[PDB]
DNA sequence: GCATCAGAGCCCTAAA
DNA sequence: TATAATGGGAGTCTGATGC
RNA sequence: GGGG
């Protein structure tokens, strides 16, 4: 019943989401270069804010314990970028 | 659909006892009223490049390939020529019958007027938008919002 | 009222 | 690591107590 | 499945 609550994608929507996922990964790669951070750490920080405050935990491999302090600190370094970055 | 902006200089000749004097013409505005049908005639010899709008028309004479004249036919003026037709100086291009007005899609910014005999020749500085449609396929995404301003070279899809 | 649950004797043999 | 594929299969009778 |  719960899966049946998400409608199946149209060919356009399927391509759209897929497109956005690929572009986002490339964005995280670029955001790593600009910032001097770790692409995975950035990815988990990006992902943390999307899913919300609900899910926050240490991720095996990330260099920092991923607690609300670090996701705020790192998010503030990402939001300190110029408009084009 | 991209409505492309065109700003061009086109001429017209009308009787004098029939044209209403204004410094500019808004779209839809009446340009002249003819007592009897008047034949607008070629003032150059050339091959005709005819460009028809939604309402109204453009006519462009060229010899060799160099454009020698650009004429504007408002609404109420029926072309008597077809695209790519050879014309000689003085043969009627279009008939103007009754009330002739600006088309809905095209304006007249600055209007210069010369007087010769019983006719006036308008040099019209016209601004209008010519529509062109583009088809977007499922694997394509439109990167541009409704109403965006684009110059030559900008990516739309 | 009606459903949901947890009760319903002991020891022994051999077969699995 | 690349056609496309998008929602499952299956079976007595007691008495006491909390909705 | 038998025994008491």
Swiss-Prot record, chain A:
Residues 1-28 are annotated as: Sigma-70 factor domain-1. It is found in: Cytoplasm. Transmembrane segments: none annotated. It comes from the Bacteria. Belongs to the sigma-70 factor family. RpoD/SigA subfamily. Contains 4 domains, connected by flexible linkers. In the active conformation, the domains are in an extended conformation, each making extensive interactions with the RNA polymerase catalytic core. In the autoinhibited state, sigma-70 factor domain-1 packs closely together with sigma-70 factor domains-2 and -4, contrary to the extended conformation that is seen when the protein is part of the RNA polymerase holoenzyme. Interacts transiently with the RNA polymerase catalytic core formed by RpoA, RpoB, RpoC and RpoZ (2 alpha, 1 beta, 1 beta' and 1 omega subunit) to form the RNA polymerase holoenzyme that can initiate transcription. Sigma factors are initiation factors that promote the attachment of RNA polymerase to specific initiation sites and are then released. This sigma factor is the primary sigma factor during exponential growth. This is RNA polymerase sigma factor SigA. The chain holds residues 86 to 170 of 423 of the full protein.
Swiss-Prot record, chain B:
DNA-dependent RNA polymerase catalyzes the transcription of DNA into RNA using the four ribonucleoside triphosphates as substrates. The RNAP catalytic core consists of 2 alpha, 1 beta, 1 beta' and 1 omega subunit. When a sigma factor is associated with the core the holoenzyme is formed, which can initiate transcription. Belongs to the RNA polymerase beta' chain family. This is DNA-directed RNA polymerase subunit beta'. It comes from Thermus thermophilus (strain ATCC 27634 / DSM 579 / HB8). The gene is rpoC.
């Amino acid at each position: 019943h719960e899966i049946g609550q998400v409608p199946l994608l149209t060919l356009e929507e399927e391509v759209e989401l897929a497109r956005k996922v690929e572009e986002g990964m490339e964005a995280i790669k670029k955001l790593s270069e600009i910032t001097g951070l770790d692409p995975d750490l950035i990815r988990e920080v990006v992902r943390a804010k999307i899913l919300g405050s609900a899910r926050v935990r240490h991720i095996p491999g990330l260099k920092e314990t991923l607690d609300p302090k670090t996701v705020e600190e790192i998010d503030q370094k990402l939001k300190s970028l110029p408009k084009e970055h | 659909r991209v409505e492309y902006v065109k700003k061009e200089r086109a001429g017209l000749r009308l009787p004098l006892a029939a044209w209403v004097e204004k410094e500019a013409y808004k779209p839809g505005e009446i340009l002249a009223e003819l007592p009897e049908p008047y034949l607008f005639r070629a003032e150059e010899e050339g091959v005709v490049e005819l460009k028809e709008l939604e309402e109204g028309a453009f006519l462009v004479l060229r010899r060799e390939d160099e454009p020698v004249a650009t004429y504007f036919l408002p609404v109420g003026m029926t072309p008597l020529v077809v695209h790519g037709e050879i014309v000689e100086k003085g043969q009627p291009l279009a008939e103007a019958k009754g009330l002739l007005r600006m088309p809905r899609q095209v304006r007249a910014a600055q209007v210069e007027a010369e007087e010769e005999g019983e006719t006036v020749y308008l040099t019209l500085f016209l601004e209008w938008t010519e529509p062109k449609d583009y088809r977007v396929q499922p694997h394509m995404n439109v990167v541009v919002p409704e109403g965006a301003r684009v110059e030559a070279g900008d990516k739309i899809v």
